[PDB]
Amino acid sequence: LTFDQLQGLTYLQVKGTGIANTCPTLDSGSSNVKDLKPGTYKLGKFCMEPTSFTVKEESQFKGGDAEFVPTKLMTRLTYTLDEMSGQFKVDGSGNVELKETDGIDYAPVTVQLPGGERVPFLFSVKELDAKGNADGFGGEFVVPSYRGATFLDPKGRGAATGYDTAVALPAAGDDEEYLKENIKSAGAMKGQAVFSIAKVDAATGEIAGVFESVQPSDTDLGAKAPKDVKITGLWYAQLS
Amino acid sequence: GRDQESTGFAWWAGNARLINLSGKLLGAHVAHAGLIVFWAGAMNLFEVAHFVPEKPMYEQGLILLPHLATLGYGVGPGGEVIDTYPYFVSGVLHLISSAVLGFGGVYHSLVGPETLEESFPFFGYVWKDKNKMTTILGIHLIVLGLGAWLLVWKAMYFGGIYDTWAPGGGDVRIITNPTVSPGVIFGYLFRSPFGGDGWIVSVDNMEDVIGGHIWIGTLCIFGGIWHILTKPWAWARRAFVWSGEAYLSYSLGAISIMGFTACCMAWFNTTAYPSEFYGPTGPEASQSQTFTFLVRDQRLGANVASAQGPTGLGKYLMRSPTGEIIFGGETMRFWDFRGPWLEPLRGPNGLDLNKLKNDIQPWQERRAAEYMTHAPLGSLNSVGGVATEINAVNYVSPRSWLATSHFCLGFFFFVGHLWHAGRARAAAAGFEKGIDRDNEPVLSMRPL
Amino acid sequence: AYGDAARVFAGNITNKSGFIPYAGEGFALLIPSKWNPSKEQDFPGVVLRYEDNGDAVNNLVVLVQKVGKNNIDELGSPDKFLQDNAYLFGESAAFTGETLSEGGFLPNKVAAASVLDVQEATDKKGKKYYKYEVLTRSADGDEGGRHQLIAATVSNGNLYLIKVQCGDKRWFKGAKREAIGAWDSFTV
Amino acid sequence: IFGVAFSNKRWLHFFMLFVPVTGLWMSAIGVVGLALNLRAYDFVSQEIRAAEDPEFETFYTKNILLNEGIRAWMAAQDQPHEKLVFPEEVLPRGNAL
Amino acid sequence: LNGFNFNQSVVDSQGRVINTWADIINRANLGMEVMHERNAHNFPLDLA
Amino acid sequence: XXXXXXXXXXXXXXXXXXXXXXXXXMEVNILGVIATALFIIIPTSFLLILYVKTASQ
Amino acid sequence: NPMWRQGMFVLPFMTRLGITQSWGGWTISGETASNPGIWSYEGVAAAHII
Amino acid sequence: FVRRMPTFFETFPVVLLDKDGVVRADVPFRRSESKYSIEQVGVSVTFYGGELDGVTFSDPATVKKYARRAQLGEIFEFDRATLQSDGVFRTSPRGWFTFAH
Amino acid sequence: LDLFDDRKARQAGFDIIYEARDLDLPQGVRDGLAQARENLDVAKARIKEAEKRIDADLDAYIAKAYWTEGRNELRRQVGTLRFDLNAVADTLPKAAKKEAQAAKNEFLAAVEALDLQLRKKNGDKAAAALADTKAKLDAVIAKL
Amino acid sequence: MLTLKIFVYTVVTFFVSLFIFGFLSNDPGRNPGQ
């Protein structure tokens, strides 16, 4: 649905349908990004609706394939970043600079790999500063830890709150066997995203396109090795 | 009266001696009607006498005055109580009417004829008379239809009804275009009772409430006329026990459903049970808490939009499993909640971040702050708060009293269905007094 | 054998103000009735500590510290004095890791104190009090933050300070009256 | 209705006596064990497992965390002879509530 | 509509609270309340 | 203390002993205990059921 | 690490006739499963049980 | 002095007390706004006699480690690899005899 | 603990939530109704602000077919309009009080009719209702 | 999933219809009394 079509609906006509987890479609407009006046713009209603989640799996078949195996979603329609705002810089030559500041810009997503492995990840574009031409402008964003520093594991252990040992074992606690799990870290990561401006409507100041984002998955608060998650989808924004 | 010697019913089943005594049975039902009217008047005067304007209705343990308030009596914009005289006259009118009702019940029970059949053929009846029973059913079905029309007459022609969703703030509003479309009416009746649907509890505007009571008033009048001019058909005569105790069990089952429905109405509905009078619902208080802290934390400086909680989900805002932007935390379960204070800040996609960031009015903040401190949590001795609270506040929500009491009544009246229906079939078949030793049915049956 | 008859048909409660007067050494305050005397010493120079029976978060502490000054302004401006005494609200020394997932906090930060009020109130006798209200919020969100009413004044070269900590869920439930009452009652 | 029924009335009443008596006697054996703190407090296999991966969660591990709260928050007043002066920061509690 | 809450019901003449067996029960309730669902609450009141 | 942890092992041996010089033999299937127990009890019970039935007539 | 190195006895016989996919999403060849359907390793096992 | 764990507790908070019995340090559960953590107090462990003699530790991680060991009484070294010991305490023949009889 | 400055937070209503939860204060103070009646200028300002929303914001929503926003604008920041009109009308003398109340009821029926049309998404009828709503609102403001 | 829903709807309706018309089939008369 276009943005105006979405506003015509009421909350009771949208609730439970799935439209709320979709980015607006930019119809009319044109493809030449030169229709935008060269200058600075206030990014608004910036949405990123994924269309595919894939996870890089190490190939036991040798050859270092590390292909992105398809996944199945476990967490339902809770995975589209929306209402993001920031700054959009467009040049005379077509150079594009997108810098996001706030909004949703993160959403916990869990997918299941062939074999029963649930791989959670914090799908985010926090502090995304993408620079490039309108065909391929991309950048690097921040991936905060999937769990916060006050998250308590099932044994009460945590980074900023909780025990620092396996209290359950009053003698075997603090052993090098459990030391790794006893110590929990909530450091952040970084990921790479590439965007493209497929269509632009200068009349309404609305741009749309596709994106591809590769970011690490959850590390279990430092207790697990991350995986690469590739997210592809469509993005929408309103320049103003 | 009677005795066990001439009846076979002990004193603890004494009212069972009135089954075939039409006149005395009439007095009993008229007397208990006087008791119901008496309580309504007595409690109305009690609640008025114990009412102080310094506190809202839901803090003073009133359950009848909120009903009168919702009918648009003695209330102004925003739910403020402006006058108490309409509540007083309502209480007196019931209290006096109970006296004449009690006299008829006392007369028809002690002095009046024991049976109405011989002296008053119009009122006389025998339970097995399927025709006469439907006429009595038909007549009392019409008076129910007229009662339903009184509600729509008041909401459309006599002052109006209190609309908590009214534009410009909740106030007494005259309904002019009730929703009478069949699709809307059938939509409520046949939607699931589960979350998001809520069956008829989910009626969310007074146009639907009045439009619904137009259908009920019209159906009852037509159903009353139909059940007067007809008698049960062949398929009905072979599908029901035609005895007095059987008719009682039919109502006990039906009244049991109504008790459960009332329990869920008082707990969830915010349209026919405005939170200005009944207090916040369970979901409302939970949503109010996250709203209150979001407002405070934004003022203390925080992008509530991108604030991440300890679990990785949004601390203040997240997405519902269908995509709507909802408040975060354990309140995620109550994302279906719709209130007159949070709806203005809700676009077609859910909560509006821009509205939540720049356009939150102080009356909305005041409403949410009050609701979170008057959550329905409370104790039996009326100590407000969670079980780990201290004796500081004397408060239990009227919704908590209404939901709990009318669930207990609803369940016991379901056992009434089970009891009075199992006995009706057994009494009619003829083995409610025990197994006959001469011909035990199992002995005739072949061994298992 | 005390011999005192029970107060049958008495009619008047002995104390129903909610505060029990306390006369310390050089200071006086109105300790809330429902608070028990604690036996822990959180900070240097603690001479009095009471905590609520219900929640141990609700507590008050009077701190005397020799400082060799006369007036509290010599200890700095009210802004400077609070910053010098940031140990009053606690510290995050144990947590040394980095984190960006604490929504509503600066990077690598799990606690934050928001100064709501500063006042240089003067006593009836002309005693300069630096009174402060601060809402400390943590990543765990315990109690929904802690209101910490602090009033300090220096007499005879000793700094007399009172810190009344009240949990937020208790603050808007009614504990505010007791907290503010003890804070205002503090007199040196 | 149930598939099985009593056919001996004497056996029915002895059963009505055996069930309650045997139940109370078995409980009395367990309390004798608790007198010496010989308690079936934990499953070591699940506790060892949970200590090795912070993802393993069962309702049993959730009860163990509940017992930690009961012991710490109750001991100071329930056992005044121990003279426990637990400061607030050392008591185990979850986020927010 | 919870059970009887007798917390801080007995108070002495000067306003001090004299604990009962109900208050010891409350301390156990406080232990369970703060530990149940550790990572599920963001706000102090357990309304849900 | 890991120096003292391995000090005792190289020094005087640890506890719980073992039958003779060494009888751990952890390679032993251990499932053979269940195999031997089941192969004994199950046929033994079968024979005892028939004999007691026979001896009683 | 094929089937025959793991002591699998009835797995080769299911695979010999055409069963190659599991409800777990994996295939015996190593590729990813494509809607295994009823006749998986788990489905055939459940069928012989029923 | 570390407050020793009473026999009724499966798990006990570790708290260090001075000679008069006042809490001076502990391993806090909430490390966000602690006021007694051994890092703020600068607690150190010195061992007299036994395997570690004269050895002192100042890093908080090892001080916390031995403080937890201290609340269980005297600090011994245990071989947990020979028998693959799980790490939970067990009963003496005195305890088993009393329960059985 | 790191220290932050939030003295300005008290201004712009930090204590509004804490004022609304003080069961020691009357309900009128808690709900803010008493303060509006205390200073009519506060209520009179809200009436003026309400008029701006109806006269400016509602027109674009109907023209652009933003039905939900049109109804929300009719209940957000206007949710006190009924109270504010009542508070100002009471201060007027009795002779003018009946006139102000009569004018208000005409406007209240007008805004309710406008809200009904936005519910039905009838753009042509909603535009006509908005014109009547704006006209009747000016009549009420003149009399107050 | 739709095929599943239709299958379940057919099954639920079948058993409920048996229940409804089972009790409409002179059930009160299905008793050993005289």
Ligand SMILES: CCCCCCCCCCCCCCCCCC(=O)OC[C@H](CO[C@@H]1O[C@H](CO[C@H]2O[C@H](CO)[C@H](O)[C@H](O)[C@H]2O)[C@H](O)[C@H](O)[C@H]1O)OC(=O)CCCCCCCCCCCCCCCCC
């Ligand atoms: C031994 C005797 C046993 C007795 C058992 C009795 C239990 C009592 C309950 C039901 C049975 C009695 C008969 C029906 C009574 C009415 C139940 C009802 O009005 O139902 C709805 C109510 C309330 O629903 C709530 O309705 C609410 C409506 O509020 C909305 O609208 C409101 C009004 O504006 C407010 O605006 C509010 O903010 C807004 O959210 C919300 O939508 C909630 O999400 C929604 O849960 O209770 C519910 O939720 C019920 C949830 C479904 C039932 C529970 C599962 C049972 C499953 C059985 C098998 C599965 C399916 C078959 C079932 C039925 C087949 C016909």
Ligand code: CLA
């Ligand atoms: C409007 C509903 C209704 C009506 C008209 C009747 C009518 C009748 N019932 Mg019935 N019954 C009902 C509902 C109803 N019942 C419900 C809801 C239940 C489930 C509890 C029962 C269970 C029941 C039983 C078990 C029996 C009857 C019997 C009878 C017959 C004689 C009863 C009598 O003499 O009373 C006598 C009145 C008393 C003895 C007073 C005792 C009442 C209780 C003990 C006290 C209630 C007060 C207390 C505060 C309630 C708390 C409720 C709260 C917990 C929610 C009579 C025709 C008897 C019968 O079968 O006759 C053939 C009989 O055995 N009823």
Ligand code: CLA
């Ligand atoms: C709503 C409650 C209610 C009502 C309306 C009735 C009504 C009736 N019962 Mg009944 N009953 C009840 C509860 C009730 N019962 C309960 C709880 C029990 C269990 C203890 C019984 C057990 C019972 C038995 C065993 C019998 C009845 C019988 C009767 C009938 C005749 C009574 C009679 O004539 O004797 C006369 C009674 C009196 C003379 C007492 C005088 C007291 C008066 C009537 C009360 C008036 C007080 C009031 C303040 C005055 C109002 C006046 C007004 C103008 C202001 C009658 C219709 C009898 C019957 O079946 O009839 C065949 C009978 O056998 N009941």
Ligand code: CLA
């Ligand atoms: C001790 C017994 C007891 C008591 C004290 C109550 C008390 C109450 N019940 Mg309850 N109930 C009970 C037993 C009881 N009930 C039992 C046993 C059941 C069956 C299980 C129910 C089922 C039940 C339901 C379904 C509901 C209640 C409800 C209520 C509340 C409102 C009552 C009401 O308005 O009804 C009705 C009022 C009348 C019958 C008199 C008015 C009738 C006319 C037609 C009204 C017209 C007014 C008109 C518009 C005025 C304008 C006039 C003109 C200008 C047009 C009230 C506090 C309601 C509630 O609050 O839900 C929680 C409700 O929904 N009860």
Ligand code: CLA
């Ligand atoms: C309290 C009110 C009441 C009562 C006690 C009865 C009782 C009875 N009715 Mg009656 N009826 C009523 C109201 C009532 N009716 C109204 C208001 C109407 C107008 C619509 C009718 C129209 C009506 C007709 C046409 C017939 C009866 C018949 C009967 C008898 C057969 C009972 C039966 O099998 O129903 C059991 C119900 C079913 C087997 C089907 C279940 C359907 C229910 C309603 C669930 C559907 C829910 C949904 C919301 C309904 C949509 C209806 C729509 C208009 C909103 C019985 C004695 C029959 C009879 O004997 O003729 C004389 C007959 O054919 N009634």
Ligand SMILES: CC1=C(/C=C/C(C)=C/C=C/C(C)=C/C=C/C=C(C)/C=C/C=C(C)/C=C/C2=C(C)CCCC2(C)C)C(C)(C)CCC1
């Ligand atoms: C049958 C019978 C029974 C029952 C009965 C009944 C149930 C009755 C009822 C009755 C009734 C139901 C009665 C009522 C009455 C009422 C009245 C008589 C009223 C009066 C009023 C007045 C006197 C006045 C008042 C006032 C006013 C005017 C206003 C305010 C103030 C006042 C309140 C003062 C019984 C069980 C016993 C058994 C036996 C039989």
Ligand SMILES: CC1=C(/C=C/C(C)=C/C=C/C(C)=C\C=C/C=C(C)/C=C/C=C(C)/C=C/C2=C(C)CCCC2(C)C)C(C)(C)CCC1
């Ligand atoms: C007012 C209003 C409304 C509503 C309306 C209506 C219209 C209702 C109706 C309803 C109906 C209309 C119905 C209901 C119910 C029914 C039922 C519940 C049924 C019953 C029956 C049965 C259950 C059966 C029985 C029998 C048979 C015959 C079969 C077999 C078996 C037997 C025999 C038993 C609305 C919501 C809109 C809104 C709000 C208000």
Ligand code: OEX
């Ligand atoms: O989920 Mn089961 O437990 Ca009923 O409270 Mn709220 O939620 Mn959760 O917390 Mn508490």
Ligand SMILES: [Cl-]
């Ligand atoms: Cl929460």
Ligand SMILES: [Cl-]
């Ligand atoms: Cl839990």
